[PDB]
Design a protein around this ligand. Structure first.
Ligand SMILES: *[C@@H]1O[C@H](CO)[C@@H](O)[C@H](O)[C@H]1NC(C)=O
Lengths: 50, 50
């Protein structure tokens, strides 16, 4: 909003409050909230499972 | 570009060449190319099946 620089090449989410005053370019990447989970580790088999 | 119309909400890509002559907005959804294929059915074979 002041003037010490006119570029900021860093992940800076494009949002309404950040768009009211700042001016943004086209998005060069896409984001999104997604879950994370311990994958199925394995069968964990006991040979005496019979 | 003739100004005979105004805001035109419809499918319209944000490609480079189109942006050269007209202005755009921030996209209201994002999409790409994806594989379309038939659901598996399961008319399973002979010998192998048993
Ligand atoms: C399952 O049934 C449909 C309708 O007969 C058929 O088109 C398809 O080939 C069968 N199997 C597969 C590969 O989905």
């Amino acid at each position: 909003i002041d003037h010490k620089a006119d570029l900021a090449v860093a992940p800076l989410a494009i949002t309404y409050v950040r768009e009211k005053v700042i001016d943004f370019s086209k998005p060069f990447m896409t984001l999104g909230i997604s879950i994370l989970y311990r994958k199925p580790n394995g069968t964990n088999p006991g040979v005496f499972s019979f």
